[PDB]
Amino acid sequence: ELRVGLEESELWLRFKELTNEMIVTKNGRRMFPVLKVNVSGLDPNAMYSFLLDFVAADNHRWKYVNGEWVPGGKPEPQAPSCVYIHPDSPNFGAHWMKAPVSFSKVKLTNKLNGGGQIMLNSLHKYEPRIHIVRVGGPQRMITSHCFPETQFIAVTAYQNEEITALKIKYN
Ligand SMILES: C1CC(Cc2nc(C3CC3)no2)CCN1
Incomplete structure (x- = not known):
């Protein structure tokens, strides 16, 4: 059976217990933490x-x-x-x-x-989700997986200073 797991769930759960925030910019901002599966x-x-x-x-x-x-x-x-x-x-x-x-x-x-x-x-509040797409073969297949632990609100600047602190502490 195809198994999908979240790497560093420990750390994501610290962000989630505070309500996680991710910065969005006109040019685009990379995520922290990074989704690793x-x-x-x-x-x-x-x-x-x-x-x-x-x-x-x-x-x-x-x-x-x-x-x-x-x-x-x-x-x-x-x-x-x-x-x-x-x-x-x-x-x-x-x-x-x-x-x-x-x-x-x-x-x-x-x-x-x-x-x-x-x-x-x-x-808005977002739940990251991946799709694993079997390609090239005769039988195309998709397996999808959500990561509730990685939910965040998209923000132009951090609102909760406890998030600001966690982001720096663990980067
Ligand atoms: C250019 C290459 C890329 C190739 C592609 N992969 C897929 C599905 C299987 C994942 N569809 O297209 C298309 C977008 N930018």
Whole structure:
């Protein structure tokens, strides 16, 4: 059976207990922590691409009100995010299983951009999700996995100073 695991869940859970925030810029900002995934149960000889997207966890705008994140009352439908292709893609199962798959180069933006960068809505809450796409073979297949531990709110600047502190302490 194909098994997908979060590397450094310990650390992600410290960010999650505070409500995690990720900066978005016009040019795009890399994530900290970086999403790293442990994968086993691939066919070492089969071909795969690793895709990353961000699900809008709810339909609301969030605001940091008197030291606490609170959702607005005017939900809007959220269009799905674009997909980031892991730059090692396409690659053999053996490649993907030999070390954690690290999405260190994805950049989060707030502006429709040349590409590479993934556009998010500021002050929305996101749940990172990967797709493992078996390619080249006759039987195309997709396995998807969400990472609740890695939920964050997209922000143009950190609201919760405890997040600011954690980000520096562990970088
Ligand atoms: C150029 C190359 C890239 C190749 C590609 N992979 C996929 C699916 C299997 C993951 N679709 O296209 C397309 C975007 N930029």
